[PDB]
Design a protein around this ligand. Structure first.
Ligand SMILES: CCCCCCC(=O)N(O)CCC(=O)O
Ligand SMILES: [Fe+3]
Lengths: 94, 407, 103, 107, 78, 95, 79, 107, 94
DNA sequence: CCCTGGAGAATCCCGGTGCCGAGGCCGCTCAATTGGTCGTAGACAGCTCTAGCACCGCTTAAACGCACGTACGCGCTGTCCCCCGCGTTTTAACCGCCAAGGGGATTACTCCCTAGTCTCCAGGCACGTGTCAGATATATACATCC
DNA sequence: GGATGTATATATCTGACACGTGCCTGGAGACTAGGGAGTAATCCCCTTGGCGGTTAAAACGCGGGGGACAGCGCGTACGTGCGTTTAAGCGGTGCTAGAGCTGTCTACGACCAATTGAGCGGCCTCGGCACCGGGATTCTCCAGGG
């Protein structure tokens, strides 16, 4: 028998950081999985096209940053870029 | 969490101001002594003015013991009697047993979930019936007592208002039981009936609006709008009297008066409805508002047109001695009996309205009752009679005795 | 219940607003199930013979169709309000579909 | 003795996986090579978006005096925002309904 | 003739959820044709997707992909 | 003299036949540079980027005006007003 | 105040090519605002594309890509 | 002994390049491996569409008493056909103009 | 110096088989090149997604045919499928 | 004609079912970690030269501002039909239970097709040159608006 | 009919399209090896089909009043023509900066081998709400006795 993958456990982890008492049904979990997959697909495709346009063969964090600035509206992009930069900085320091 | 952009949220008139304002300051009600409320007074005035009797001297009423409780009413009519209850918040009806009503009424105020009112408990043909007597003068002029075939009335056994068991219009004696805070929105009593209303215990506040043609149009329009929770009608009219009835008062409300009622304290009331021969035009007018606003028959005067046919017959018979009852109804009436004339203008006007009304109804709405023989010949006779009585001397008509009485 | 007589109790377009407020608050599907299934199977019978359907496929199709129709009705309502009216007509739907780019 | 292992997610300070995202990027046919900082940045962005959505949905759910999140709350939160409504403009949410809207000329 | 199974009360309910007060008597025949066109397009795309995979059962993933190809992404079915 | 509504038809027929640009070049270039100054300073521009922008803008406006004319005809009129533009742009999805 | 460069006769010519017969007097400001919004929307993407490539000159391919990102494919300026 | 070469276009009977299409498919980040029948199919489809559009444009040009083809002829050919106007619905042609069309109410 | 590529020669060859008298300008040639590139990218992307959906790592003529059926409308798909089938059949035999 | 007790029944404090969706441990298999090796992709320094910017004169085609008058937008009445609300009879949608078989999902395994290499060489791209298709000037012919 | 907008038809310039060559690098021919998929066998899930019971939604008819549509009058704002003012286009100068290309050196991501713990599927609780459920406390129907 074969097993499948999902994002349920990380959704629970994030939910227990902003609203500890409340729960969530299964339909909302499926909706959240679809949303995460859609956003990942969008960003990956845009970064791939950006890498192609400059005669490059690799994808780095600069491409992902440019794709985030292109796809997200308004201050959402600002906060996303700030948090991603913070995460990268804290990861490379180790 | 933090590090986000950085919210939002995910009866319409005030009955208390209608009780506090001083703007409902018309003077429509006459305070009277019981002794002056007689048939002569009705003949001369046509029972056009709302009356309060601050005491019952001279009225000829009888009430039960002054500490009579809702549980006493219950034992007199039966724990299992189904009673129409009004949900005050919605002005809609529900049904429960009298024992259930009693439990609600005996529940402390803070423990009652909703406000319910009983305004429609007709207790004729129960043990309570003989404990309550209405003003004497009403007996002389009530169409039920004076016009309806007596052998039918006497045959009634059912104490509820079940229509298939009802032998006459059973609208004469009602018990009203109202908790503090109850409110009945503006209305006109069914069929254009006049109402007598006695505060046995407690108190009531009435807002009274006169049945001018303008106010009755507003009333009908307000009913047809369906916006009665939104609009306090007493604001929309020319003139309105707010008045308090206290314990022991007796109130008489003429045909067609538009009125709303608030209950400031737990209260028990005895009252009842009557049609009479002195304001027929208004009676018919109210009936036609009920028809046009589609009031269900449940909330209307039973056997209304039937009664009107019997009224015509009694007038003809008492004045000319010509009967338009069936032979069998004549015989029933004769058996019961063995156990130049001047009408008021009120009556003359009334009877011409009545004849014109009944004659013009189509067959399926005429409601000719079973006691009537030839309704076309009765009509023909009333027309002749009204021509011959058209010169009635208004002075001489003030006899103090009704034209129509049982011998 | 036997009919009662002598019981006392006080008391176009008004019901429409209440219906709008009721339906704009619920979330269930507003079309029946079996007729939609039969319509879908009849339509699909033209492209292939002896086809089978899962239940979730029909559910998704019904939901998408209802969402499309609701959006079209909102746009038709805006079109009708434009021409100083309150009643929607087929030409409103035609104008909405033509401006949207569907025609 | 080989040093005790430690996941890259903890090393960066995240809850969303990094190795799984790295594998998806590597086997997703996007480029010939994949760098070393892309999965961390992408996981951080996805976690941020998920946290915003969940916070709004929880607020909307509690405002109705309930303890559980259902698709209606997600729909209300998404459609009642101004920036998340632009990112999810062409998306249909199953069993979510519509916002209450009545034209003034009709009332 | 199953299109007649979409009764007038159902169209009225859909319009009420849309926000419509009054409805003319000719709307239903237009709505039925619009629904026919939409369903025909979606089902044709889903059938092509199903046939490519050498199957005889139309799964929900085929419908999801067909809807996504037309720009009507749907959430809650995989 | 000509009665109103005859020169307009002549201009419509004339301009549905031609294919040149209907806006001047220097004002458009000035507007483009003035707008672009708000995102990055000291930007240079090729000779064809401005032409492509002009073509795209003109096509957009012509389509918008066609939709606006449809909206105006709907309301039993022959004159276009801002509310027609607002209705068309709202139904399209841009607002 | 460069937006005033788009003059009334140019807007009337565009409307004539669109097929209108009569034009009110309050159309010009709306048209100018719509055109300005469209221009900012395109130029933001074009400048972002130029910035990513470590350049200082906006080329034609940047504009073409920015237009293509919004479903407004343009033929004749490269591909 | 290497025999004389022969392009795959000549083998398939096409006027579009096959090896170039194969190289573009290979280096385009589309799949791990590319089959041997895709390039000829793609070239045939592209050639058919090109021939159709060119024939329509040539007829449109001949109607105007000219011997060359300009963008106006391509625009007229595309917008005068029911099938090519649906495939290229959202495409703008530089220096193409519009189609003659006047509403009946204004006339 | 670097040399670029285009489809001009093949477009001219196709033009000469249907209109030997008619010429063409350079702007129309650029437009035709853009059209060819657009169609190629559309078909290739659709085929790639079709391959990914069925857990496969190769692109064959079956997926190209499916993408052609999905993208082209009406009779265009029929004629294109017939042309491609004929071309493949004639190429395999030799 | 009043009590009364042999059956009655209502619902219901509450004393049990019983499904329903979440929520929590256990085993364990496969995927993420860790430790090395290398070879090519990308960063950086340097030189060239194509094109983008700034400027000056002047021709003139286009934009601007005014008169005006008429025709199209807008508001007010009337009437008549079409749509809404309600009651009653009719129909089929929905739910529980049972049965059967079509077809989707998994697993060996065999081989044939596609990837990576090494040369040969011709198809296509950059650089040059002529002539023929197209613009525009200018004196009539004819249909079209007043 | 008269005045005006548009089509009719010949002359001459003119510069861009089509035809030539030189050569260089990517496509073609021949070779080897390895793993992806094609096919058969198997199992069990889940889709189709049927029937009975219940009742909630759909359909049909009638009354009436509210809105849609046509008709008429007013009035002001927009289209048309003209005399005046402006800067857009075009031709030619001058400079320089930044895009494009070449050559090195290195350091970072792919591949391989050995290891272990994380998350996933399968059972065990756990607090609700929809019914039951004798029976039974309170109040009660009913022809007898008193
Ligand atoms: C029809 C019964 C007799 C009259 C009493 C009921 C009535 O109609 N009221 O006006 C009194 C309302 C109240 O007291 O809340
Ligand atoms: Fe009353």
């Amino acid at each position: 028998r074969s097993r499948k993958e999902s994002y349920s456990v990380y959704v629970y982890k994030v939910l227990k950081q902003v609203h500890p008492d409340t729960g969530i049904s299964s339909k909302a979990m499926g909706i959240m999985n679809s949303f995460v997959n859609d956003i990942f697909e969008r960003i990956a495709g845009e970064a791939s096209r950006l890498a192609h346009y400059n005669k490059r063969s690799t994808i780095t964090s600069r491409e992902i940053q440019t794709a985030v600035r292109l796809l997200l509206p308004g201050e959402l992009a600002k906060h996303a870029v700030s948090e991603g930069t913070k995460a990268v900085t804290k990861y490379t320091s180790s | 969490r933090y590090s986000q952009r950085l919210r939002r949220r995910y009866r319409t008139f005030d009955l208390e101001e209608k009780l506090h304002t001083n703007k409902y300051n018309a003077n429509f009600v006459t305070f009277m002594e019981g002794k002056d409320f007689n048939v002569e007074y009705i003949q001369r005035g046509g029972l056009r003015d709302p009356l309060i009797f601050k005491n019952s001297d001279g009225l000829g009423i009888k009430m039960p013991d002054p500490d009579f409780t809702v549980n006493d009413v219950k034992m007199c009519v039966g724990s299992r009697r189904m009673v129409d209850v009004m949900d005050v918040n919605t002005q809609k009806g529900i049904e429960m047993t009298m024992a259930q009503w009693t439990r609600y009424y005996e529940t402390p105020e803070e423990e009652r979930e909703k406000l319910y009112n009983v305004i429609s408990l007709e207790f004729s043909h129960t043990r309570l019936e003989n404990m309550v007597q209405r003003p004497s003068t009403v007996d002389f002029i009530d169409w039920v007592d004076n016009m309806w075939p007596r052998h039918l009335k006497e045959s009634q056994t059912e104490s509820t208002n079940a229509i298939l068991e009802m032998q006459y219009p059973k609208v004469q004696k009602y018990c009203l039981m109202s908790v503090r805070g109850c409110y009945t929105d503006f209305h006109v009593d069914f069929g254009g009936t006049s109402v007598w209303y006695h505060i046995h215990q407690g108190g009531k506040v009435f807002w009274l609006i006169p049945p001018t043609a303008h106010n009755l149009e507003l009333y009908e329009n307000w009913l047809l709008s369906g916006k009665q929770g939104d609009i306090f009608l007493g604001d929309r009219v020319s003139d309105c009297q707010r008045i308090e009835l206290k314990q022991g008062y007796t109130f008489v409300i003429p045909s067609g008066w538009i009125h709303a009622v608030y209950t400031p304290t737990d209260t028990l009331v005895f009252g009842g409805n009557f049609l009479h021969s002195f304001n027929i035009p208004m009676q018919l007018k109210i009936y036609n508002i009920e028809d046009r606003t589609r009031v269900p028959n449940k909330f209307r005067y039973p056997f209304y047109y039937e009664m009107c046919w019997y009224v015509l017959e009694r007038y003809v018979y008492c004045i000319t001695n010509r009967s338009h009852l069936t032979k069998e109804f004549q015989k029933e009436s004769l058996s019961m009996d063995l156990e130049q004339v001047h009408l008021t203008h009120f009556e003359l006007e009334g009877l011409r309205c009545l004849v014109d009304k009944l004659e013009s109804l189509p067959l399926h709405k005429k409601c000719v009752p079973t006691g009537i023989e030839d309704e076309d010949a009765l009509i023909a006779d009333v027309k002749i009679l009204l021509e011959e009585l058209a010169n009635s001397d208004p002075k001489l008509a003030l006899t103090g005795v009704p034209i129509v009485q049982w011998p | 219940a036997p009919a009662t007589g002598g019981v006392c109790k006080p008391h176009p377009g008004t019901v429409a607003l209440r219906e709008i407020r009721r339906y704009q608050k619920s979330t269930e599907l507003l079309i029946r199930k079996l007729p939609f299934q039969r319509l879908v199977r009849e339509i699909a019978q033209d492209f292939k013979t002896d086809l089978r359907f899962q239940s979730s496929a029909v559910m998704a199709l019904q939901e998408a169709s209802e969402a499309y129709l609701v959006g079209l009705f909102e746009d038709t309502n805006l079109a009708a309000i434009h021409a100083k009216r309150v009643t929607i007509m087929p030409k409103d739907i035609q104008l909405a579909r033509r401006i949207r780019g569907e025609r | 003795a080989r040093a005790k292992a430690k996941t890259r997610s903890s090393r960066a300070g995240l809850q969303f996986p990094v190795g799984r995202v790295h594998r998806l990027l590597r086997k997703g046919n996007y480029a010939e090579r994949v760098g070393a900082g892309a999965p961390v940045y992408l996981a951080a962005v996805l976690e941020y978006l998920t946290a915003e959505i969940l916070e709004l949905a929880g607020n909307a759910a509690r405002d109705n005096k309930k303890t559980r999140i259902i698709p209606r709350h997600l729909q209300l939160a998404i459609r009642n925002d101004e920036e998340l409504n632009k990112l999810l403009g062409k998306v249909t949410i199953a069993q979510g309904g519509v916002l209450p809207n009545i034209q003034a000329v009709l009332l | 003739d199953n299109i007649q199974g979409i009764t007038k009360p159902a169209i009225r309910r859909l319009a009420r959820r849309g926000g419509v007060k009054r409805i003319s008597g000719l709307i239903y025949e237009e709505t039925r044709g619009v629904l026919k066109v939409f369903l025909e397009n979606v089902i044709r795309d889903a059938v092509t997707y199903t046939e490519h995979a050498k199957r005889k059962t139309v799964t929900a993933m085929d419908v999801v992909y067909a809807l996504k190809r037309q720009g009507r992404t749907l959430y809650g079915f995989g």
